[PDB]
Coordinates of C-alpha atoms in Angstrom, one line a residue:
Chain A
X2 CA 39.0 75.2 35.9
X3 CA 41.5 75.1 33.0
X4 CA 43.4 78.2 32.1
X5 CA 41.9 80.6 29.5
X6 CA 43.6 81.9 26.3
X7 CA 42.0 84.4 23.9
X8 CA 43.2 85.9 20.6
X9 CA 41.0 88.7 19.2
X10 CA 41.4 89.7 15.6
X11 CA 39.5 92.2 13.4
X12 CA 39.7 89.6 10.6
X13 CA 38.4 86.0 10.4
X14 CA 41.4 84.7 8.5
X15 CA 43.9 86.0 11.1
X16 CA 41.7 84.6 13.9
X17 CA 41.7 81.2 12.2
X18 CA 45.5 81.3 11.9
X19 CA 45.7 82.2 15.6
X20 CA 43.4 79.3 16.5
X21 CA 45.4 76.8 14.3
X22 CA 48.7 77.8 15.7
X23 CA 47.5 77.6 19.3
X24 CA 46.2 74.0 19.2
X25 CA 49.3 73.0 17.3
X26 CA 51.7 74.5 19.8
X27 CA 50.4 73.0 23.1
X28 CA 47.8 70.8 24.7
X29 CA 44.8 73.2 24.5
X30 CA 41.3 72.9 23.1
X31 CA 39.9 75.4 20.7
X32 CA 36.3 75.5 22.2
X33 CA 34.9 77.9 19.6
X34 CA 35.0 81.5 18.5
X35 CA 33.1 84.6 19.6
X36 CA 31.6 87.0 17.0
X37 CA 31.0 90.6 18.3
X38 CA 30.4 92.2 14.9
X39 CA 32.3 95.0 13.1
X40 CA 34.7 92.3 11.8
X41 CA 35.8 91.4 15.4
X42 CA 36.2 87.8 16.2
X43 CA 37.9 86.0 19.1
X44 CA 39.5 82.5 19.2
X45 CA 39.2 80.8 22.6
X46 CA 41.5 78.0 23.9
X47 CA 41.6 76.2 27.2
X48 CA 44.1 73.9 28.9
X49 CA 46.7 73.9 31.7
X50 CA 48.3 77.3 32.5
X51 CA 51.6 76.3 30.9
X52 CA 50.0 75.0 27.8
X53 CA 47.7 78.0 27.3
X54 CA 50.7 80.3 27.8
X55 CA 52.7 78.6 25.1
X56 CA 49.8 78.4 22.8
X57 CA 48.8 82.0 23.2
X58 CA 52.3 83.2 22.5
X59 CA 52.5 81.2 19.3
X60 CA 49.0 82.2 18.2
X61 CA 50.0 85.9 18.6
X62 CA 53.2 85.6 16.6
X63 CA 51.6 83.8 13.6
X64 CA 48.3 85.8 13.5
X65 CA 50.2 89.1 13.5
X66 CA 51.7 88.2 10.1
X67 CA 48.3 87.7 8.5
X68 CA 45.7 89.9 10.2
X69 CA 44.9 92.7 12.5
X70 CA 45.3 91.5 16.1
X71 CA 43.2 93.4 18.5
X72 CA 44.0 91.8 21.8
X73 CA 45.9 88.8 23.3
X74 CA 45.4 87.7 26.9
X75 CA 45.7 84.7 29.2
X76 CA 43.6 84.1 32.4
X77 CA 45.2 81.2 34.4
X78 CA 42.3 80.6 36.8
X79 CA 39.0 82.1 35.5
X80 CA 36.3 82.8 38.1
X81 CA 33.5 80.3 38.1
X82 CA 31.0 83.1 37.5
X83 CA 32.9 84.0 34.3
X84 CA 32.7 80.4 32.9
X85 CA 29.0 80.2 33.9
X86 CA 27.9 83.6 32.4
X87 CA 30.2 83.8 29.4
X88 CA 30.6 81.4 26.5
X89 CA 34.1 80.2 27.1
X90 CA 33.6 76.4 26.7
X91 CA 33.8 75.2 30.3
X92 CA 30.3 75.6 31.8
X93 CA 30.6 74.7 35.6
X94 CA 28.8 71.4 36.2
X95 CA 29.5 70.0 32.8
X96 CA 31.7 67.2 34.0
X97 CA 31.2 63.4 34.3
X98 CA 33.1 63.3 37.6
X99 CA 30.9 66.1 39.1
Chain B
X2 CA 42.6 67.0 5.9
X3 CA 42.4 69.2 2.8
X4 CA 44.5 72.4 2.8
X5 CA 42.6 75.6 3.6
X6 CA 42.4 78.8 1.5
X7 CA 40.9 82.1 2.6
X8 CA 40.3 85.5 1.0
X9 CA 38.9 88.1 3.4
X10 CA 37.4 91.3 1.9
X11 CA 35.5 94.3 3.4
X12 CA 33.1 94.0 0.5
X13 CA 30.7 91.2 -0.7
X14 CA 31.5 91.9 -4.4
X15 CA 35.2 91.5 -4.0
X16 CA 34.8 88.3 -2.0
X17 CA 32.5 86.9 -4.7
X18 CA 35.1 87.7 -7.3
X19 CA 37.8 86.0 -5.1
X20 CA 35.7 82.9 -4.7
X21 CA 34.9 82.7 -8.4
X22 CA 38.6 83.1 -9.3
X23 CA 39.7 80.4 -6.8
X24 CA 37.4 77.6 -8.0
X25 CA 38.3 78.5 -11.6
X26 CA 42.1 78.5 -11.0
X27 CA 42.4 75.1 -9.4
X28 CA 40.7 72.0 -8.2
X29 CA 39.3 73.4 -5.0
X30 CA 35.8 73.5 -3.4
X31 CA 34.3 76.7 -2.3
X32 CA 32.6 75.4 0.9
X33 CA 30.9 78.7 1.9
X34 CA 31.6 82.2 3.3
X35 CA 31.9 83.6 6.8
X36 CA 30.1 86.8 7.8
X37 CA 31.6 88.7 10.7
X38 CA 29.7 92.0 10.3
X39 CA 31.0 95.4 9.6
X40 CA 31.1 94.5 5.9
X41 CA 33.7 91.8 6.5
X42 CA 33.3 88.5 4.6
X43 CA 35.6 85.6 3.9
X44 CA 35.6 83.1 1.1
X45 CA 36.6 79.6 2.1
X46 CA 38.0 76.9 -0.3
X47 CA 39.3 73.4 0.4
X48 CA 41.5 71.1 -1.7
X49 CA 45.0 69.8 -2.1
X50 CA 47.8 72.1 -0.9
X51 CA 49.1 72.8 -4.4
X52 CA 45.6 73.6 -5.6
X53 CA 44.6 76.0 -2.8
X54 CA 47.9 77.8 -3.2
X55 CA 47.2 78.4 -6.9
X56 CA 43.7 79.4 -6.1
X57 CA 44.4 82.0 -3.4
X58 CA 47.1 83.8 -5.4
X59 CA 44.6 84.1 -8.3
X60 CA 41.8 85.1 -6.0
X61 CA 43.9 87.8 -4.4
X62 CA 44.8 89.1 -7.8
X63 CA 41.2 89.1 -9.0
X64 CA 39.7 90.5 -5.7
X65 CA 42.3 93.3 -5.6
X66 CA 41.0 94.7 -8.9
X67 CA 37.5 95.0 -7.5
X68 CA 37.8 95.5 -3.8
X69 CA 39.9 96.1 -0.7
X70 CA 41.3 92.8 0.3
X71 CA 41.7 92.4 4.1
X72 CA 43.6 89.1 4.4
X73 CA 44.8 86.2 2.3
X74 CA 46.1 83.0 3.9
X75 CA 46.7 79.3 3.3
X76 CA 46.9 76.6 5.9
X77 CA 48.2 73.4 4.2
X78 CA 47.5 71.0 7.2
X79 CA 44.8 72.5 9.4
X80 CA 44.5 71.0 12.9
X81 CA 41.5 68.7 13.5
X82 CA 40.3 70.9 16.4
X83 CA 40.0 73.8 14.0
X84 CA 37.9 71.9 11.5
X85 CA 35.8 70.7 14.4
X86 CA 35.2 74.0 16.1
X87 CA 35.2 76.4 13.1
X88 CA 32.9 76.3 10.0
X89 CA 35.4 75.4 7.3
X90 CA 33.4 72.8 5.4
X91 CA 35.5 69.8 6.6
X92 CA 33.9 68.6 9.8
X93 CA 35.9 65.6 11.1
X94 CA 33.9 62.4 10.9
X95 CA 31.8 63.5 7.9
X96 CA 33.2 60.9 5.6
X97 CA 31.7 57.8 3.9
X98 CA 34.9 55.9 4.3
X99 CA 34.8 56.3 8.1
Chain C
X2 CA 24.4 80.1 -16.0
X3 CA 23.3 83.7 -16.6
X4 CA 25.9 86.5 -16.1
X5 CA 26.2 88.1 -12.7
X6 CA 26.0 91.8 -11.9
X7 CA 26.7 93.3 -8.4
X8 CA 26.5 96.8 -7.0
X9 CA 27.7 97.3 -3.5
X10 CA 26.9 100.5 -1.6
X11 CA 27.4 101.6 2.0
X12 CA 23.9 102.9 2.1
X13 CA 20.5 101.2 1.5
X14 CA 19.0 104.1 -0.4
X15 CA 21.9 104.1 -3.0
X16 CA 21.7 100.4 -3.3
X17 CA 18.0 100.6 -4.0
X18 CA 18.6 103.2 -6.7
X19 CA 21.3 101.0 -8.2
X20 CA 18.8 98.0 -8.2
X21 CA 16.0 100.1 -9.8
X22 CA 18.3 101.5 -12.5
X23 CA 19.7 98.1 -13.4
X24 CA 16.3 96.3 -14.0
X25 CA 15.1 99.3 -15.9
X26 CA 18.1 99.5 -18.2
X27 CA 18.2 95.9 -19.4
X28 CA 16.7 92.4 -19.3
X29 CA 18.1 91.4 -15.9
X30 CA 16.4 90.1 -12.7
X31 CA 17.0 91.6 -9.3
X32 CA 17.2 88.4 -7.3
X33 CA 17.7 90.0 -3.9
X34 CA 20.2 91.9 -1.8
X35 CA 23.0 90.8 0.5
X36 CA 23.4 92.4 3.9
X37 CA 26.9 92.2 5.4
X38 CA 26.5 94.7 8.2
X39 CA 28.3 98.0 8.9
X40 CA 25.9 99.6 6.5
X41 CA 27.1 97.5 3.6
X42 CA 24.5 96.1 1.2
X43 CA 24.8 94.6 -2.3
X44 CA 22.3 94.5 -5.1
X45 CA 22.5 91.4 -7.3
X46 CA 21.1 91.1 -10.9
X47 CA 21.4 88.3 -13.4
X48 CA 20.8 87.9 -17.1
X49 CA 22.7 87.6 -20.4
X50 CA 26.2 89.0 -20.5
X51 CA 25.2 92.0 -22.7
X52 CA 22.2 92.8 -20.5
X53 CA 24.1 92.5 -17.2
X54 CA 26.8 94.7 -18.6
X55 CA 24.4 97.5 -19.7
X56 CA 22.5 97.3 -16.4
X57 CA 25.6 97.4 -14.2
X58 CA 26.9 100.5 -16.0
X59 CA 23.6 102.3 -15.6
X60 CA 23.3 101.2 -11.9
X61 CA 26.7 102.5 -11.2
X62 CA 26.1 105.9 -12.8
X63 CA 22.8 106.6 -11.0
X64 CA 23.8 105.1 -7.6
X65 CA 26.9 107.3 -7.5
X66 CA 24.7 110.4 -7.4
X67 CA 22.8 109.3 -4.3
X68 CA 25.1 107.1 -2.1
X69 CA 28.5 105.7 -1.4
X70 CA 29.3 103.0 -4.0
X71 CA 31.8 100.5 -2.6
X72 CA 32.2 98.2 -5.5
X73 CA 30.8 97.5 -9.0
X74 CA 31.6 94.2 -10.9
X75 CA 30.3 91.8 -13.5
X76 CA 31.0 88.1 -13.8
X77 CA 29.9 86.8 -17.3
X78 CA 30.1 83.1 -16.5
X79 CA 30.0 82.4 -12.7
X80 CA 31.4 79.0 -11.6
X81 CA 28.8 76.4 -10.6
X82 CA 30.3 76.2 -7.2
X83 CA 29.8 79.9 -6.7
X84 CA 26.1 79.7 -7.5
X85 CA 25.7 76.7 -5.2
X86 CA 27.7 78.0 -2.2
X87 CA 26.8 81.7 -2.4
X88 CA 23.3 83.3 -2.4
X89 CA 23.2 84.8 -5.9
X90 CA 19.8 83.6 -7.0
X91 CA 20.7 80.8 -9.4
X92 CA 21.1 77.6 -7.4
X93 CA 22.2 74.9 -9.8
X94 CA 19.5 72.3 -10.2
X95 CA 16.7 74.9 -9.7
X96 CA 15.3 74.5 -13.3
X97 CA 12.2 72.8 -14.7
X98 CA 14.1 71.6 -17.8
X99 CA 16.8 70.1 -15.6
Chain D
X2 CA 3.0 101.6 -8.1
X3 CA 3.3 104.3 -5.5
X4 CA 6.4 106.6 -5.6
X5 CA 9.2 105.7 -3.1
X6 CA 10.7 108.0 -0.5
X7 CA 13.8 107.3 1.6
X8 CA 15.7 109.0 4.3
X9 CA 18.9 107.2 5.5
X10 CA 20.6 108.2 8.7
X11 CA 23.4 106.8 10.8
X12 CA 21.2 107.2 13.9
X13 CA 17.9 105.8 14.9
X14 CA 16.7 109.1 16.4
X15 CA 17.4 111.1 13.2
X16 CA 15.6 108.5 11.2
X17 CA 12.6 108.6 13.6
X18 CA 12.4 112.4 13.2
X19 CA 12.6 112.0 9.4
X20 CA 9.8 109.4 9.4
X21 CA 7.6 111.5 11.6
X22 CA 8.2 114.6 9.5
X23 CA 7.4 112.7 6.2
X24 CA 4.0 111.3 7.2
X25 CA 3.1 114.8 8.7
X26 CA 4.1 116.7 5.6
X27 CA 2.1 114.8 3.0
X28 CA -0.3 111.9 2.3
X29 CA 2.3 109.1 2.5
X30 CA 2.5 105.9 4.4
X31 CA 5.6 105.0 6.5
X32 CA 5.8 101.3 5.6
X33 CA 8.7 100.5 7.9
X34 CA 12.4 100.9 8.3
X35 CA 15.5 99.0 7.1
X36 CA 18.3 98.0 9.4
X37 CA 21.7 97.5 7.7
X38 CA 23.9 97.5 10.8
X39 CA 26.7 99.8 11.7
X40 CA 24.1 102.2 13.0
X41 CA 22.6 102.7 9.6
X42 CA 18.8 102.8 9.3
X43 CA 16.4 104.0 6.5
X44 CA 12.9 105.3 6.8
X45 CA 10.6 104.2 3.9
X46 CA 7.4 106.0 2.8
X47 CA 5.0 105.3 -0.1
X48 CA 2.5 107.5 -1.8
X49 CA 1.8 109.6 -4.9
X50 CA 4.9 111.2 -6.5
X51 CA 3.9 114.7 -5.5
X52 CA 3.3 113.6 -1.9
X53 CA 6.6 111.7 -1.4
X54 CA 8.6 114.5 -2.9
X55 CA 7.0 117.0 -0.4
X56 CA 7.6 114.5 2.4
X57 CA 11.3 113.8 1.8
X58 CA 12.3 117.4 1.6
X59 CA 10.6 118.0 4.9
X60 CA 12.2 114.9 6.3
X61 CA 15.7 115.8 5.2
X62 CA 15.1 119.2 6.8
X63 CA 13.9 117.8 10.1
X64 CA 16.4 114.9 10.3
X65 CA 19.4 117.3 9.5
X66 CA 18.6 119.2 12.7
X67 CA 18.9 116.1 14.9
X68 CA 21.3 113.8 13.1
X69 CA 23.7 113.0 10.3
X70 CA 21.7 112.3 7.2
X71 CA 23.4 109.7 4.9
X72 CA 21.1 109.7 1.9
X73 CA 17.8 111.2 0.6
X74 CA 16.2 109.9 -2.6
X75 CA 12.9 109.6 -4.4
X76 CA 11.9 107.0 -7.0
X77 CA 8.6 108.2 -8.7
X78 CA 8.0 104.9 -10.6
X79 CA 9.9 102.0 -9.0
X80 CA 10.3 98.9 -11.1
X81 CA 8.1 95.9 -10.1
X82 CA 11.1 93.7 -9.6
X83 CA 12.4 96.1 -7.0
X84 CA 9.1 96.0 -5.1
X85 CA 9.1 92.2 -5.4
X86 CA 12.7 91.6 -4.3
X87 CA 13.2 94.4 -1.7
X88 CA 11.2 95.2 1.4
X89 CA 9.5 98.5 0.4
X90 CA 5.9 97.8 1.6
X91 CA 4.4 97.4 -1.8
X92 CA 4.7 93.7 -2.7
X93 CA 3.2 93.2 -6.2
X94 CA 0.0 91.1 -6.1
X95 CA -0.9 92.3 -2.5
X96 CA -4.1 94.1 -3.6
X97 CA -7.8 93.4 -3.1
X98 CA -8.6 94.6 -6.7
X99 CA -6.3 91.9 -8.2
Chain E
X2 CA -0.4 109.6 22.0
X3 CA 2.1 110.4 24.7
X4 CA 5.2 112.5 23.8
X5 CA 8.3 110.7 22.7
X6 CA 11.9 111.1 24.1
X7 CA 15.0 109.4 22.6
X8 CA 18.6 109.4 23.7
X9 CA 21.0 107.7 21.3
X10 CA 24.5 106.7 22.5
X11 CA 27.3 104.8 20.8
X12 CA 27.8 102.9 24.0
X13 CA 25.5 100.7 26.1
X14 CA 26.7 102.0 29.5
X15 CA 26.0 105.6 28.5
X16 CA 22.6 104.6 27.1
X17 CA 21.7 102.9 30.4
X18 CA 22.7 106.0 32.4
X19 CA 20.5 108.1 30.0
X20 CA 17.6 105.7 30.6
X21 CA 18.0 105.7 34.4
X22 CA 18.3 109.4 34.6
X23 CA 15.2 110.0 32.4
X24 CA 12.8 107.8 34.4
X25 CA 14.1 109.3 37.7
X26 CA 13.6 112.9 36.5
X27 CA 10.0 112.8 35.4
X28 CA 6.9 110.7 34.9
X29 CA 8.0 108.8 31.8
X30 CA 8.2 105.1 30.9
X31 CA 11.3 103.5 29.5
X32 CA 9.6 101.3 27.0
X33 CA 12.8 99.6 25.8
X34 CA 15.9 100.2 23.7
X35 CA 16.7 100.0 20.0
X36 CA 19.8 98.2 18.8
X37 CA 21.1 99.3 15.3
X38 CA 24.5 97.8 15.4
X39 CA 27.9 99.4 15.3
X40 CA 27.7 100.0 19.0
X41 CA 24.7 102.3 18.5
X42 CA 21.8 102.0 20.9
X43 CA 18.8 104.3 21.7
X44 CA 16.8 104.7 24.9
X45 CA 13.2 105.5 24.4
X46 CA 10.9 107.1 27.0
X47 CA 7.2 108.2 26.7
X48 CA 5.0 110.4 28.8
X49 CA 3.4 113.9 28.8
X50 CA 5.2 116.6 26.8
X51 CA 6.4 118.4 29.9
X52 CA 7.6 115.1 31.5
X53 CA 9.4 113.9 28.4
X54 CA 11.1 117.3 28.0
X55 CA 12.4 117.3 31.6
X56 CA 13.5 113.7 31.4
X57 CA 15.3 114.1 28.1
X58 CA 17.2 117.1 29.3
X59 CA 18.4 115.2 32.4
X60 CA 19.2 112.1 30.4
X61 CA 21.4 114.1 28.1
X62 CA 23.3 115.9 30.9
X63 CA 24.2 112.7 32.8
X64 CA 24.9 110.4 29.7
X65 CA 27.3 113.0 28.3
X66 CA 29.5 112.4 31.4
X67 CA 29.8 108.7 30.8
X68 CA 29.5 107.9 27.1
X69 CA 29.3 109.1 23.5
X70 CA 25.9 110.7 22.9
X71 CA 25.0 110.5 19.3
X72 CA 21.6 112.3 19.3
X73 CA 19.0 113.7 21.7
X74 CA 15.4 114.6 20.5
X75 CA 11.8 115.0 21.7
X76 CA 8.7 114.5 19.6
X77 CA 5.6 116.0 21.5
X78 CA 2.9 114.4 19.3
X79 CA 4.3 111.5 17.2
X80 CA 2.2 110.6 14.1
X81 CA 0.0 107.5 14.5
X82 CA 1.9 105.9 11.5
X83 CA 5.2 106.3 13.4
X84 CA 3.9 104.5 16.5
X85 CA 2.4 101.7 14.3
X86 CA 5.4 101.2 12.0
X87 CA 8.3 101.8 14.4
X88 CA 9.0 100.1 17.8
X89 CA 8.4 103.0 20.2
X90 CA 6.2 101.2 22.7
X91 CA 2.8 102.7 22.0
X92 CA 1.2 100.6 19.3
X93 CA -2.1 102.3 18.3
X94 CA -5.0 100.1 19.4
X95 CA -3.1 98.7 22.4
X96 CA -5.5 100.3 25.0
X97 CA -8.2 98.9 27.3
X98 CA -10.3 102.0 26.7
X99 CA -10.1 101.7 22.9
Chain F
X2 CA 17.7 96.7 44.1
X3 CA 21.4 95.8 43.8
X4 CA 23.8 98.4 42.5
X5 CA 24.8 98.2 38.9
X6 CA 28.4 97.9 37.5
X7 CA 29.4 98.1 33.9
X8 CA 32.6 97.9 31.9
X9 CA 32.2 98.5 28.2
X10 CA 35.0 97.6 25.8
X11 CA 35.5 97.5 22.0
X12 CA 37.0 94.0 22.4
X13 CA 35.7 90.7 23.8
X14 CA 39.0 89.9 25.4
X15 CA 39.2 93.1 27.4
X16 CA 35.6 92.7 28.5
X17 CA 36.3 89.1 29.7
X18 CA 39.2 90.4 31.7
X19 CA 37.1 93.2 33.1
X20 CA 34.4 90.7 34.1
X21 CA 36.9 88.3 35.6
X22 CA 38.5 91.1 37.7
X23 CA 35.1 92.4 39.0
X24 CA 33.8 89.1 40.4
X25 CA 37.3 88.5 41.9
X26 CA 37.6 91.9 43.5
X27 CA 34.3 91.9 45.4
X28 CA 31.0 90.1 46.2
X29 CA 29.2 90.8 42.9
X30 CA 27.5 88.6 40.4
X31 CA 28.4 88.8 36.7
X32 CA 24.9 88.5 35.3
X33 CA 25.9 88.4 31.6
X34 CA 27.1 90.6 28.8
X35 CA 25.5 92.9 26.2
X36 CA 26.4 92.7 22.5
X37 CA 25.7 95.9 20.6
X38 CA 27.7 95.1 17.5
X39 CA 30.6 96.9 15.9
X40 CA 32.8 95.0 18.4
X41 CA 31.2 96.7 21.4
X42 CA 30.5 94.5 24.4
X43 CA 29.6 95.3 28.1
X44 CA 30.2 93.3 31.2
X45 CA 27.3 93.6 33.8
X46 CA 27.7 92.9 37.5
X47 CA 25.2 93.3 40.4
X48 CA 25.8 93.5 44.1
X49 CA 25.9 95.9 47.0
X50 CA 27.0 99.5 46.2
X51 CA 30.3 99.2 48.0
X52 CA 31.1 95.9 46.3
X53 CA 30.2 97.0 42.8
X54 CA 32.3 100.2 43.2
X55 CA 35.3 98.1 44.3
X56 CA 34.7 95.7 41.4
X57 CA 34.5 98.3 38.6
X58 CA 37.6 100.2 39.6
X59 CA 39.5 96.9 39.6
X60 CA 37.8 95.9 36.3
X61 CA 38.8 99.2 34.6
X62 CA 42.3 98.7 35.8
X63 CA 42.5 95.2 34.5
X64 CA 40.7 95.8 31.2
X65 CA 42.9 98.8 30.4
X66 CA 46.0 96.6 30.4
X67 CA 44.5 94.4 27.7
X68 CA 42.1 96.5 25.7
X69 CA 40.5 99.9 24.8
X70 CA 37.9 100.5 27.5
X71 CA 34.9 102.5 26.2
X72 CA 33.0 103.2 29.3
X73 CA 32.9 102.5 33.1
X74 CA 30.0 103.4 35.3
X75 CA 28.2 102.5 38.5
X76 CA 24.5 103.1 39.3
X77 CA 24.0 102.5 43.1
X78 CA 20.2 102.6 43.0
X79 CA 18.9 101.7 39.5
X80 CA 15.3 102.6 38.7
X81 CA 12.8 99.7 38.6
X82 CA 11.8 100.6 35.1
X83 CA 15.4 100.2 33.9
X84 CA 15.7 96.7 35.5
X85 CA 12.3 95.8 33.9
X86 CA 13.0 97.2 30.4
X87 CA 16.7 96.4 30.1
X88 CA 18.6 93.1 30.4
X89 CA 20.6 93.7 33.7
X90 CA 19.9 90.4 35.5
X91 CA 17.6 91.8 38.1
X92 CA 14.1 91.6 36.7
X93 CA 11.6 93.0 39.2
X94 CA 9.3 90.3 40.6
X95 CA 11.9 87.5 40.1
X96 CA 12.3 86.8 43.8
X97 CA 11.3 83.9 46.1
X98 CA 10.4 86.3 48.9
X99 CA 7.8 88.0 46.7

């Protein structure tokens, strides 16, 4: 599975800026955003480990100027159970080559 | 794609005043508002880069008199993945010109 | 469009008292209330500029005795885009004379 | 219209005790409860003005022993627009006598 | 009606530990849990007064070690209006012997 | 019934890292995650008592590096009423062996 990048912000605007910067910096796909209430939202991007690493670093830098960044993290090889149980945009089995 | 303008406020009233001020200040379309819970809401406008910039600065000014503004930001050239994955009122492909 | 009055309270009871006082003080219609989570709720009334001004002032005075008022604001002539994009009870086109 | 009694608590348990105490203290009907997020909930009772006043004071007393009461308020003669626009268990027109 | 026991925790894990300890300590039924947002959740158990009293005391002791307990309370004889209007797992009339 | 493991975090990213670490550390199934609002989320894993214990300690370790962990707890032998009333991924009766 592709690597996993996540930028959590207590602020929609900052999360949007994180997402925009990430997809512009590297070959990663913004698959969606998670809403957990209380003003907390998370931008999720996926791609190769190198791409997700470069995107996440750029997303953090730019979002920090506009909003309240809660967390920034990269998971190079997410477990298949994680992708199946959590909404991260790469449901196992969703593949034409499968 | 149109430029993107956003005023985030922990308060519906302040966001409404922001939104009202933006569409009055320049030729921009208020496409809707995002609810992220915890009292956090974001007014979203779209238009040309010059127009959205003029709108947001007036919106920040107006919202600040009524509420606690959380974030104010403009993205002149938002990435297509962002408009596709996030609800910003400019879904790629939604155009009569095709 | 009719003028717009809004009383935001972090407390349902105080918001209800705001709403009750507003419709009693002047010729304005309580069109509903907006729920943005985190305990935040907003009472929305509409009517002529003078009526909404008198209502909002009475709503603020009484609500302040019972709850936590977040914001109080009046918009005399809300933009048509605001009424169309936001739930303020006067959707443009919803008129028998139209 | 019946008088309106309300006990708002940042805590479900405290609200439940408030509601229980109100309907036990006087001839009032617990019509339901409002959820505004952030842990905020409001118990709503309806009945004659004397009954709701007796209920709320007992409810405040009982809720205070269990939780953090946010607001306590009585509206003897609520405006018809309020009962029509807000969920208080006495929708105008809902009556067999017509 | 059976007695009513409630353990409110600002934390799902602590609420789960409360619920588990309660049903293990005495003859009470965990009927469900109430979600009021802001991280607030409440475990609700019902049974005879003695059983609910023993359960609630054990639920409080164990939950306090794991999470943030907001409120703990027992209602021996909840009013019929409470069980009808609030989701506490004993809707009046839901009985085969009725 | 399988043992129950839980990592609660006020942050989606920290919870995702917890969940990822748990299923990687031991033979446990991430059954899902609970959303209680206010930014609070809980990762839920099921498996043998030894496995879930190994998972949670690794999950706490991993989540703590990324976010603010709210609660960490293991229930070796959860009561059947808990699995029936709460969404923990092991509904009693859901078994081919019957």
